[PDB]
Amino acid sequence: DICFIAGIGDTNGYGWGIAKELSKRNVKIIFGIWPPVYNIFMKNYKNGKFDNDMIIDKKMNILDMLPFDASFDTANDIDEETKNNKRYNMLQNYTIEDVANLIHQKYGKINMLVHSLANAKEVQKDLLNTSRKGYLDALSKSSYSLISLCKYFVNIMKPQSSIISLTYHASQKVVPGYGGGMSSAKAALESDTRVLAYHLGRNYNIRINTISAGPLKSRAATAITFIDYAIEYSEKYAPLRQKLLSTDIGSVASFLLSRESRAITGQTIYVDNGLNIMFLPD
Amino acid sequence: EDICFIAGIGDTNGYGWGIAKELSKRNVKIIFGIWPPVYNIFMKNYKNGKFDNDMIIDKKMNILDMLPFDASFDTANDIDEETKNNKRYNMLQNYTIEDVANLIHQKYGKINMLVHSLANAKEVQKDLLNTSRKGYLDALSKSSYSLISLCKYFVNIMKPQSSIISLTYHASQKVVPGYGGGMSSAKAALESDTRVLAYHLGRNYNIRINTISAGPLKSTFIDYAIEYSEKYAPLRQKLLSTDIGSVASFLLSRESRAITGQTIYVDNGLNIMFLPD
Amino acid sequence: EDICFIAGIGDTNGYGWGIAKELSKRNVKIIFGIWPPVYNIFMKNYKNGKFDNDMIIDKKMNILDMLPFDASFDTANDIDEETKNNKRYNMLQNYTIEDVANLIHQKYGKINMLVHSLANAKEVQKDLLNTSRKGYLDALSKSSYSLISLCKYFVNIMKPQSSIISLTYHASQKVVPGYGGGMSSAKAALESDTRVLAYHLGRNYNIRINTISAGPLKSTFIDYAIEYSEKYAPLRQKLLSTDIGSVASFLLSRESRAITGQTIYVDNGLNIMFLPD
Amino acid sequence: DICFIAGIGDTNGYGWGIAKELSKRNVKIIFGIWPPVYNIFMKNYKNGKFDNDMIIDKKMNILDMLPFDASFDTANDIDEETKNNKRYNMLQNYTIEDVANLIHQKYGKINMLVHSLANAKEVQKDLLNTSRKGYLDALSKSSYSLISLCKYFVNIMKPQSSIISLTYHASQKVVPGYGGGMSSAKAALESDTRVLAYHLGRNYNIRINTISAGPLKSRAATAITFIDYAIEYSEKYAPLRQKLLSTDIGSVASFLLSRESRAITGQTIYVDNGLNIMFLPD
Numbered sequence A, D: 001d002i003c004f005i006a007g008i009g010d011t012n013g014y015g016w017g018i019a020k021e022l023s024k025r026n027v028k029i030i031f032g033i034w035p036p037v038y039n040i041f042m043k044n045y046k047n048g049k050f051d052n053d054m055i056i057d058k059k060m061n062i063l064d065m066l067p068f069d070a071s072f073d074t075a076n077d078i079d080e081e082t083k084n085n086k087r088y089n090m091l092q093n094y095t096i097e098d099v100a101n102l103i104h105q106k107y108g109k110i111n112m113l114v115h116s117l118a119n120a121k122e123v124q125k126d127l128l129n130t131s132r133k134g135y136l137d138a139l140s141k142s143s144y145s146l147i148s149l150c151k152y153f154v155n156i157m158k159p160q161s162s163i164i165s166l167t168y169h170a171s172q173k174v175v176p177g178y179g180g181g182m183s184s185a186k187a188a189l190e191s192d193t194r195v196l197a198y199h200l201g202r203n204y205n206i207r208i209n210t211i212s213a214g215p216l217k218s219r220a221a222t223a224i225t226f227i228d229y230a231i232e233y234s235e236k237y238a239p240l241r242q243k244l245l246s247t248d249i250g251s252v253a254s255f256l257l258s259r260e261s262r263a264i265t266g267q268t269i270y271v272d273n274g275l276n277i278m279f280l281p282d
Numbered sequence B, C: 001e002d003i004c005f006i007a008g009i010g011d012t013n014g015y016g017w018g019i020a021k022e023l024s025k026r027n028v029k030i031i032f033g034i035w036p037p038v039y040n041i042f043m044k045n046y047k048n049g050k051f052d053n054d055m056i057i058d059k060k061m062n063i064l065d066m067l068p069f070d071a072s073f074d075t076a077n078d079i080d081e082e083t084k085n086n087k088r089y090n091m092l093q094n095y096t097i098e099d100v101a102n103l104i105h106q107k108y109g110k111i112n113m114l115v116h117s118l119a120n121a122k123e124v125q126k127d128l129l130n131t132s133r134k135g136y137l138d139a140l141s142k143s144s145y146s147l148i149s150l151c152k153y154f155v156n157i158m159k160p161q162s163s164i165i166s167l168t169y170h171a172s173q174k175v176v177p178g179y180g181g182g183m184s185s186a187k188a189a190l191e192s193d194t195r196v197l198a199y200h201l202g203r204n205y206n207i208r209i210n211t212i213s214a215g216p217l218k219s220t221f222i223d224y225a226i227e228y229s230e231k232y233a234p235l236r237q238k239l240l241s242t243d244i245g246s247v248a249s250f251l252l253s254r255e256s257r258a259i260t261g262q263t264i265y266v267d268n269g270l271n272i273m274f275l276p277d
Ligand SMILES: NC(=O)c1ccc[n+]([C@@H]2O[C@H](COP(=O)([O-])OP(=O)(O)OC[C@H]3O[C@@H](n4cnc5c(N)ncnc54)[C@H](O)[C@@H]3O)[C@@H](O)[C@H]2O)c1
Pocket: A006, A007, A008, A009, A010, A012, A013, A014, A015, A033, A034, A037, A068, A069, A070, A071, A115, A116, A117, A118, A119, A141, A166, A167, A168, A212, A213, A214, A215, A216, A217, A218, A219, A220, A221
């Protein structure tokens, strides 16, 4: 049982929580990490900074930790500026195709893929005031990255393997302040999940679903006090008033990835203490 | 110990059984509620070892008890003659919803997993348009209201962080000609009620409740549904009652503490398809 | 001439009236069905000119007739004593669904627009969780099944390319604490039944059927709903009964020949909002 | 009552049918037209070729017919190659900002906007096999064009104005063969419709909805016998067995655009003889 988690920059995200729970079930974990934060993540790991967090009387497995940039499909896609940037030029094989081939050489076929990354340069702006170039950015890094991720991993994956991504309810209902086309990319990503589920199903016997998670105070969540407010609101209005942990998403992700969800494919599962069901406060 | 009540089962060919088999994998003690009129039969078949092979998991399914259970009656007060003097019913006792909740609580104490796995419409083979008021409401009473009732009476005998599920079918959201009698209307209400109950039980008892929208099984209309499904579903595999059961097991556990009020499709992905090919 | 039957109206403060006003704009002749127990009152108020100003469109609303109408009874056969000897009912006649369809057909011939605008649950102020079986089913019978019944008996007296609508509320899809008694379950089923009826009536009689999911009006719970709505809805304007009526008029016309089985939200866009701001 | 229809290349589309019905109600119509087909559309108009089709005992109004390219927001966005292409270099003011300013000079404020255009270079490929550049193409011309269209027209539009676009059910359910990210763009567009509806509502008292239309044998529909099959299927399985005309979409569009739908905003209305409601054939 091998899982590649694409998109973990630290310990405060959904990627980490997913990692943790996949370990409880003894699956081997390969982190794919964005180069802007790669050196410093590695450093912290070495300094045993994440050592508290790797606690489960269990200890986390971490098979490998690779540089990974979901905006590049192949090496030909890497622009020269990036190729030479201070933070990339010492690193290698970080395109989507490249990490796919890496992994396969080092470990062969794997059977679990977590897409856990999103990005938009104009997330701060709202839809109307987002540029074409900013919108297409959001969709390229949040939505298309999934598709591409699939294209390349699908054949280093065994039959009956399963894939998941992460989404947010703002695709289905309006959350003012979730901007830059981020809603649009979650909308796109939830649709692609259905279409990919059809293709990967018939053709590769491979499942794909997506988890619509609640608010977590991740690094990326602070890409705009919205989130503190979102957590506040969720903890007062959701059917379940417990605090939403990333491990909560993690245990569901783990389930989706296991053979136990063998007959669930193409779905948007909500893991959010049921907030999505409410129309009216009280 | 962990105890699950499965309300609505008459053989091994259904969901309740698949759900029971899978729960047994986590060593959950199982109590079956059986519709009184087939209860003794079921009890007989059990004795004659008829369910022996279906019961093997290599470990034996631990069936804590098997009780008469009629989802159409809330309390004893509702047992309305004739019924009281009906050939089958009169030899049995304590089969109303509230009565069953008392027995279970008395013999075993509190439980922590509830499964509503029962559907019945007396006119299930006619168009909604040709369904009678009496028929429709029987559908809603047995297949929809029963869920609320079961919750009302069982919440008192459940630990906090308990979990509930029912079974639903996609006919509620999209047209399936053939699923008549108001079974569609029933599931529509069941799914909506699952949301509403999720809010109340969640806030008031920290109890979760979800519904599994399952694909066709077996346990006429079903024979088409299955062929169509295995033809067009994203996933080519045969859908098993344990496929629903393993999902149920998960939903009924703490691993899904943050999921509630949801409709989970376990149908090989049939629901995502628009037109064939 | 074009004739619309509006089943479910007791004053000018509701949807049936707003719908009636707007239909009158297209010179549609209107027949009102009134719940028998308030029928004579309504008839009195009509006589005393109480509805005179509400009736002006500058042209006068043409009310073809006003008949007692009880959505809880399908045929005469169902009028079950007491009811037959109830203070209000016994002085009236032909108010069952089938009976009304016969009168209309007899006096005016075929119609071509039907409006189901009636909702009633006897326990509308309690939680779903505290709602009784009797209460729930009354809800489903009056607010949901009535729709099917009305279709069953009226299709015979309708021209082809006829059109039908009912009114629904978003509580069916998402939790609105306060909308209890199974009104939510009712609307859930009404919306699902609208799809199913759309298939049958569409294929079998080329008749269309849709439902309007309206925002709060007036006609307690509503007072909050309205303030919240006018605060948070995408559209700041006050929502009028004629806002629903103008949409209804459209849906009931040939201009919408290619729309059927749909739930149309007329609620200033409230439904698209997740969290406030 | 002025309406700008963005995206009509001939008489066989939804744009034309919408035009026709808006005329029945005496509203003035400005066609925005893609330059690759502009000269030839004009020619046909002049040769009175469309004269049969402009029949309603009514005759169509056509206030103006402008060149229009929804892939350009402003003149600065026009690449030099395009700027010089055989088919563009004789034409002017065809960016989104430009046609917005044109129209306003010539006629002032308008109050009706029809988005009726879509495009994807790799529509023939299916999701998995679509490139980043092809996906982003679909989203840029089918989804973002709407947003941009709004940004620029919103303030040459009076309060209480209304906007509509066109979508297809493949966003919500899987239609194999509707590829190139076209499903993804309909998914995105239906989401943006909700978010735009919130912003335009509160801020400009302006409504936006989208129509999910059935199959019509438009020029663009043949961008892949899929459609003949789609029309075949729809006419045998839809609740309504009538043939679906573009004027059917047109009369609904007209309604959405009128004050009659004054309280409907942010919605996806299905105009498809109810096919979307079916799960199972028979
Ligand atoms: N935090 C929330 O409230 C919330 C809610 C719902 C959904 N989500 C989703 O969860 C997922 C994970 O986000 P998170 O909230 O855990 O924050 P996060 O910052 O931990 O996760 C995003 C990570 O992806 C990496 N990344 C960004 N762009 C990349 C690229 N081009 N390629 C590779 N790596 C890249 C970043 O380094 C970052 O660490 C996202 O898809 C997000 O949309 C988050």
